[PDB]
């Protein structure tokens, strides 16, 4: 089909977090049917970033999700035309991120155009002081409302001390054409920074994601 | 309620349902409905290229200069996508030709970056600031160059030279 077992990734993010503007471009690759992908990211404008890179990494495509055959695949069905998604992340100390992404496909590459705004992060909290270590593994609840697919995650952002910062993810995923809608189900995630230089001007992100039914 | 139809209006504009849109507006739908990322019906129609819905929304009171949470205006979006006719009706309806989004980009920055020469020309004709700088100090000329849009870069360079001869 149009989604090959190996797909490349090209993306641009335009960002502004607590007034700091930046642009990040990435190139990557993954295996959509295995639910795994990696992206190499470079800050093209606004280097060095004065905040935790972890608030960006989940913005850097649920086409990369292993789905069992008894759950309709909202994301893969949407191609070649693709889909967009919109997300709010509400942080424990009142920081908020709003993210929008448009996912298209050109030959054997997915293309993402991302806008991300972060605001109200405490100047001395762990995001702006770069005291995060990464995301915990998570489970996203996927459910259909208003003819589109929604995802909710009660997430934890892990902190350098060993504690954690609760972050609530709400996402709306919007196919650009009609598709068969799934029932309520889960998507388990693991996301990791595999490499970064000292300032996180260069970063490689890895994510795995598997869908499963609600009972199991 | 204006609000609850406003939400159906957002959906109709996003899906391209010119008739739905018109039906919903006749029945009182809030033309300035917004969603959780600050998109209005006008933003959505401008991005999708639904010219007829753009016109209808403008005639019935839509805010031509609404900004979404990223500082993006309908004119940014039409310029980004190359919707020349929508760029023209937005400008005629009062769109701020020099609005800046959250990274400092004007509609001219986007037209230059995404290679839409006719939009570049309309925007300059309507007073777009050819020397506008984004938050990184880049001009529309710099973006044209970075993306290999030399014809646009030539147009911008000429307009910048000529602009040095005002009073």
Author numbering:
A (entry chain A): 2 to 61, 65 to 220
B (entry chain B): 12 to 178
Reproduce, without paraphrasing, sentences from the article in which this PDB structure was first reported.
Here, we report the selection of designed ankyrin repeat proteins (DARPins) recognizing mTFP1 (monomeric teal fluorescent protein 1). Here, we report the selection of DARPins recognizing mTFP1, one of the brightest and most photostable FPs in the blue-green spectrum. We characterized these binders both biochemically and biophysically and determined the three-dimensional structure of one DARPin-mTFP1 complex. The two DARPins we report here bind specifically and with high affinity to mTFP1.
Using X-ray crystallography, we obtained a crystal structure for the tightest-binding mTFP1 binding DARPin 1238_E11 in complex with mTFP1. The mTFP1/DARPin 1238_E11 complex was obtained by mixing mTFP1 with a 1.2-fold excess of DARPin 1238_E11 and subjecting the mixture to gel filtration. Gel filtration analysis indicated a homogeneous 1:1 complex, which was used for crystallization as described in Materials and Methods. We determined the crystal structure of the mTFP1/-DARPin 1238_E11 complex in two space groups, to 1.6 Å (P6522) and 1.85 Å (C2) resolution, respectively. Both complex structures are structurally identical (Cα r.m.s.d. of 0.3 Å): The overall fold of mTFP1 exhibits the typical β-can motif of the GFP family and undergoes only minor structural changes upon DARPin binding. DARPin 1238_E11 binds into a cavity along mTFP1 including β-strands 1, 4, 5 and 6, comprising a protein-protein binding surface of 790 Å2 and thus similar in size compared to other known DARPin protein complexes. Residues from the N-Cap and the three DARPin repeats make specific contacts with mTFP1. Interactions involve hydrophobic DARPin residues Trp37, Val38, Phe71, Met103 and Val104, two salt bridges (Asp69-Lys104 and Lys106-Glu15) and an arginine-arginine paring (Arg15-Arg178) stabilized by Glu90. DARPin 1238_E11 binds along the barrel of mTFP1, using hydrophobic and charge complementation. Comparison to the crystal structures of the individual proteins showed no significant structural changes for both proteins upon complex formation.
